[PDB]
Ligand binder design. Structure first.
Ligand SMILES: [Cu+2]
Ligand SMILES: [Cu+2]
Ligand SMILES: [Cu+2]
Ligand SMILES: [Cu+2]
Lengths: 254, 383, 274, 274, 153, 51, 77
């Protein structure tokens, strides 16, 4: 049989390797520029190195968002093309949507797990937490927006190429993305707690509990996967079991 | 590295460090080192900083390039944090051992329960050798010799590997067959009757028995290998402060101002030498920064870091205050070191106040220390 | 050797459909693993990571109480998802394995190879036997309330005995400057933590109402009791996390919740396939 | 000049019906204005009125954080009501205008003309630019979640720069008895408050973990972040506030929720009118 | 004693309060010591008389930056001016919609035909203009204030 | 009418009370302010509401 | 009856009782009895035990077999 008609993985592999390489570059930058230029925040070299990296992030990540979102929204499928979609192409597009979810979740892993214990690790070799500490630059200003772009792009693709997502609003997906998304504004709570009487000594402090509540939204993967599996079963019934296409357009109507 | 960010008024009126010696300057790996000093807790302790009822003396190292063999405040081992008294002087000694080669700025800090870290002066210390040659041989009360770098390393990794292998087997016995879609269809169309496998039940029973047996066996093996163990130690450390030294100098601050578009600290004081021997001021110390004159230069540690020493201490009358004489003095601490440590940042402080240590010497060389504090007024030279 | 061919025949999958299902599994399962790593690691470290990081924070009062209560949360929800949707009993074990993978990666690359702390000083360590026994209880009982009770008891009780082989040797006494310390305490003092002073340790301190010989035992039961609650609560949270509907709209512009249903799960659909 | 005749023709209103609708508007809108004045004023003063009353309470930590979080609540609910029911984008601006009207009335008649405090010492002041930008965001985006994010950011960020022209001149330094004060502080000390001593001020105090040059900026972002949450929550509260049903009963005496529906909004009702 | 502070039990203190007459009349004038958690501790009182007019009251102060002000009339026109400007903008924004059928016809059209006829391009132009004006006014006011008073505590 | 009563009770005669709370040593129970609102404005709007 | 359970370090470094007299040894119902003594509050007060800022002198009786007519620390009721 023909694999290529309902499966493709080049974009997924490219995104995975690119994200891994970006994380490795961030790790190398931290290990090369933190002890020599990141100890004092008032030194000119600290500016030139770490605030330069911060500026690079602040200029590149909006460009990343613009390019990705504009490409996704520009090559959109009209309502006519989403109504007579080939179900094999729909299986391929659902695979693509799962791969976008995988890239988004890899970004969330980089932001919330790896570059967070590495921060606790930095919080113990410094006097007190700053605001643009080596760690922050790579995650707060780098990893955080990174996964957010992927999250939007993921939903974007789905509600642009998947008719069902263009029809109704995938409630679970909304939360799954909004969670880590809203995690980035919680840096304000983090800084406000650190700088004032919410204490700073503990890493598992009550001011750090905004991140856990906002990342609990990542558990709506259950609903996301339920929708994906239901559509996959319907597509399997339509394509291979010679069943009627009416099961694809019956339950998500007004 | 960060102390300048800390608001001046706070550090200036919290811990007043003095007589700080770092040594040796260059040490090889596995050799001993020492950081000694004294600090005065200022009577003008800022309201923002909480009282030092739980104080831990810490080391501001870039990383654990030194292993803290011991820390002693006065003469009491300060492994556990404890209370310190405001207006009293303390002595500290930190004994360390070289671990990681390189050049590292090594500080003194006093961590207070609610106030936070109060960093102190810093000096560059050099370690020459290799981190893979580091050994820290300790002897336990039970009578075993260990190395702190490699202790309980194989045990934890071994138990982690065993339990992780069991967990990976449990996970992967199911990730070897159709697992998401066919199961969902069968369950949604036919129930769970075909989804339950007796072989899985046998595996579950065997693995549960193995898990319980392993927990019990590991606990019994550990309790048989180490019959005597002590819990995690806690409590508080307690040491009497250094006795109050008699001071023949009494100082009352009348005025104080600092230049906002500049670098200067001008303090007007009334000094009284109620002793019996002439006394001459020679040094003003605050936040580790030292302003000295000829008198202060006469009694100066030649090995103190020169990046925190400024010869900029000027008096209107640089004469020795005769015994039984009250004099009005105006001290002027002016140097670029004020810009490096940001005396400039007092304009955005919710409490515009200065503090420091003024040091004076007798004709015979005896030293008197006075903790001075007051409100500073901004002077706008740009106008 | 299990019964996979019977399951596939009951699902009525042609060979291309079987291959497509296998590709779905091979794509989605690593995604779920990585998501569990990231989110569970964040939740655990920001609720109970402080006792996790350091050897001298592993005490008899707060560590064996805080750790299982925090750990049971994601385990209950993921077990709900897997068991209810696909009848898969490896939820809690998968959660703890993902947490340990993330923890080991960060300890080796963050704490050790960047911050120069020794590896033995940052053993997390394990929470796996309780998750395994919880999974076994859920599979053998098939009831989630009996699972809540018994498995939460197991999860809260087996934490300390399962970690004792790792951190028991660290409790050997040492005498430094005429003062008695546990070897974990001297390890904590030896390796300087500029951001973590001694007084921030939330560890036992003794009390006049305290029975020192029973402390851990009491901590073993309280942590169990709350677990029996927490599981249950998060089990219901699982039903919240599996909510999968769409906001569809038409005409006046009214929005209605709509659910996409599985056609194979209907009354007569499987019989009409042939 | 807008499109009002087309709207009236689409509504199928005879001229007497149009006049009756105009009378309904002229009667109900002042009632809504007065209700907003009263209730929003009470809520704001009893949650954030202390920083509102006095010049020396307007600090860099608590005022720019507490004020927008308290202010966004009624704005989100009233915006929900107006936009969802009538497609009217002036909710938050109306709320803040009503709050300011009530505040000015009470300051002139209560604080000044009864308690003899100067008017300049009791400037509230404004919170209007953030509400205006929130309204503009809601109108231009038409999505209430994007509105939540962007408009809450605007509401939390524009508070301090918008109030700086009013209270910036009050921060000029003065020297009294050899002590430096802000002019707001000396105004507070000059005019005796028998019930309000100095120590009750919940204002910044500095910390050893604090970056004095960034304080307001941090306070500008935290107040923004919570706003993005608060809006959303109160938006759902709007759906609670628009719940309009009756407890009807019949026979056994059973009570059932019943909704009165608009006949014009039905499927074929407008076509059958003619 | 501009800022509250700690006092010692069993110790004696002296106080002096310097005041300036503002409002005429006869007034009982007390001493009080407000304690953090205890509350007010009022003291003895005596009747003091002020003769004159409240409209003759002036309190001339001199600031560190070198300006003379009156505490009774200080930053009065500035706050009222900014309040009037922003309130006028808000009133215009509110009243541009309260000039046409606003409650019932809109409800009927929205419930029977959707929001297509309820969106007006002129309202979009007004919204864009007002948003640009609001952002520009915020930035301009901030810059004007920071240029007029470079030094503030 | 009910909402006008609520405005009088909760907005006007409440900041006027805060205004009174600062010219007196401590809050009483029948302070000038209270009488007009607590015992006057409060029941007033309540009657209108029921009516 | 329970004091031995109390951790030694705590009691050992809290209240140091001394010169304690109980009497009479045998008394009839409705007769008077007295428990007298002195105690030193140790300077090495353990961190686990809070400071005695609210101290009540109590009697550890099996039950109210005695009615506490009075308790006086130093000479203050
Ligand atoms: Cu951090
Ligand atoms: Cu340094
Ligand atoms: Cu009152
Ligand atoms: Cu007894």
């Amino acid at each position: 049989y023909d694999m290529s008609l309902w499966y493709d993985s080049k974009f997924y592999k490219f995104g995975m390797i690119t994200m891994l390489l970006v994380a490795i570059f961030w790790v190398w930058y931290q290990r090369y520029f933190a002890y020599s230029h990141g100890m004092d925040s008032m030194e000119p070299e600290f500016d030139r190195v770490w605030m330069g990296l911060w500026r690079v992030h602040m200029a590149i990540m909006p460009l990343f968002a613009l390019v990705t979102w504009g490409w996704i929204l520009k090559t959109r499928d009209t309502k006519e093309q989403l109504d007579n979609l080939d179900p094999k192409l729909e299986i391929k597009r659902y695979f693509y949507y799962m791969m976008w979810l995988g890239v988004y979740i890899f970004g969330v892993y980089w932001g919330g797990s790896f570059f967070t214990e590495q921060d606790a690790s930095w919080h113990q070799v410094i006097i007190r937490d700053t605001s643009f500490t080596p760690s922050h630059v790579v995650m707060f200003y780098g990893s955080f927006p990174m996964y957010i772009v992927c999250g939007v792009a993921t939903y974007l693709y789905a509600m642009t190429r998947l008719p069902l997502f263009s029809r109704g609003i995938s409630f679970p997906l909304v939360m799954a993305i909004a969670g880590p998304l809203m995690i980035l504004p919680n840096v304000g709570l983090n800084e406000w707690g650190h700088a004032f009487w919410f204490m700073e000594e503990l890493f598992s402090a009550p001011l750090h509990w905004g991140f856990v509540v906002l990342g609990w939204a990542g558990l709506f993967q259950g609903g996301v996967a339920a929708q994906i599996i239901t559509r996959y079963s319907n597509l399997t019934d339509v394509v291979w079991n010679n069943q009627s296409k009416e099961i694809l357009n019956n339950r998500i109507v007004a | 590295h960060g102390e300048r960010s800390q608001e001046p008024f706070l550090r200036m009126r919290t811990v007043q460090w003095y007589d700080i010696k770092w040594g040796p300057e260059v040490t090889k790996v596995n050799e001993n080192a020492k950081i000694t000093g004294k600090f005065h807790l200022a009577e003008d302790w800022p309201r923002a900083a909480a009282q030092p009822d739980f104080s831990f003396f810490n080391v501001g190292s870039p990383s654990p390039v030194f292993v803290r063999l011991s820390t002693k405040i006065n003469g009491h081992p300060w492994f556990i944090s404890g209370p310190l008294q405001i207006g009293r002087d303390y002595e500290f000694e930190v004994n360390l051992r070289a671990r990681i080669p390189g050049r590292h700025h090594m500080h003194a800090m006093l961590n207070v329960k609610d106030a936070g870290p109060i960093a102190g002066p810093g000096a560059w210390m050099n370690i020459t050798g290799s981190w893979d040659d580091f050994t820290n041989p300790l002897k336990l009360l039970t009578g075993e010799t260990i190395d702190s770098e490699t202790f309980n390393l194989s045990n934890g990794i071994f138990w982690h590997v065993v339990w992780m292998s069991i967990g990976i087997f449990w996970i992967g016995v199911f990730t070897a067959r159709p697992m998401f879609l066919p199961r969902s269809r069968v369950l949604l169309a036919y129930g769970d009757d075909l989804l339950m496998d007796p072989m899985d039940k046998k595996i579950t029973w065997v693995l549960a028995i193995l898990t319980l047996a392993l927990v019990w066996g590991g606990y019994r093996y550990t309790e048989n290998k180490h019959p005597y163990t002590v819990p995690i130690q806690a409590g508080q450390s307690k040491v009497a402060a250094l006795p109050v030294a008699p001071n023949p100098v009494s100082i009352v601050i009348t005025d104080a101002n600092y230049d906002v578009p500049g670098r200067a600290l001008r303090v007007t004081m009334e000094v009284t030498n109620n002793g019996d021997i002439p006394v001459t001021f020679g040094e003003f110390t605050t936040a580790g920064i030292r302003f000295i004159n000829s008198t202060g230069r006469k009694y100066l540690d030649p090995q103190y870091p020169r990046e925190l020493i400024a010869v900029g201490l000027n008096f209107d009358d640089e004469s020795a205050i005769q015994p039984g004489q009250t004099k009005e003095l105006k001290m002027e601490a002016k140097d670029a070191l004020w810009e490096i440590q940001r005396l400039m940042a007092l304009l955005g402080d919710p409490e515009s106040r200065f503090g420091g240590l003024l040091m004076s010497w007798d004709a015979e060389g005896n030293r008197h220390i006075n903790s001075i504090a007051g409100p500073v007024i901004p002077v706008f030279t740009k106008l | 050797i299990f019964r996979t061919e019977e399951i596939l025949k009951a699902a009525k999958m042609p060979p291309e459909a079987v291959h497509m299902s296998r590709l779905i599994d091979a794509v989605y399962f690593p995604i779920l693993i990585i998501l569990l790593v990231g989110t569970y690691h964040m939740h655990f470290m920001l609720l109970a990571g402080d006792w996790d990081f350091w050897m001298d924070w592993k005490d008899r009062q707060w560590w064996p109480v805080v750790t299982p209560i925090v750990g049971i949360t994601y385990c209950s929800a993921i077990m709900y998802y897997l068991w209810v949707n696909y009848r898969q009993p490896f939820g809690a074990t998968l959660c703890v394995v993902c947490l340990l993978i993330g923890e080991w990666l960060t300890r080796y690359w963050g704490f050790y190879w960047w911050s120069h702390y020794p590896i033995n000083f940052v053993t997390p360590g394990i929470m796996l036997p309780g998750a395994l026994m919880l999974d076994f209880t859920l599979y053998l009982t098939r009831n989630w309330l009996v699972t809540a009770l018994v498995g939460g008891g197991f999860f809260g009780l087996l934490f300390y005995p399962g970690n004792w082989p790792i951190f028991g040797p660290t409790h050997l006494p040492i005498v430094v400057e005429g003062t008695l310390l546990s070897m974990a305490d001297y390890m904590g003092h030896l390796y300087v933590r500029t951001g973590t002073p001694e007084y921030v340790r939330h560890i036992e301190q003794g009390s006049l109402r305290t029975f020192g010989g029973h402390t851990t035992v009491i901590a073993a039961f309280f942590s169990a009791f709350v677990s029996m609650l927490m599981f249950t609560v998060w089990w219901y949270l699982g039903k919240v996390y599996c909510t999968a509907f769409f906001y569809v709209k038409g005409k006046r512009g009214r929005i209605v919740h709509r659910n996409d249903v599985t056609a194979f799960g209907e009354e007569g659909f499987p019989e009409g396939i042939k």
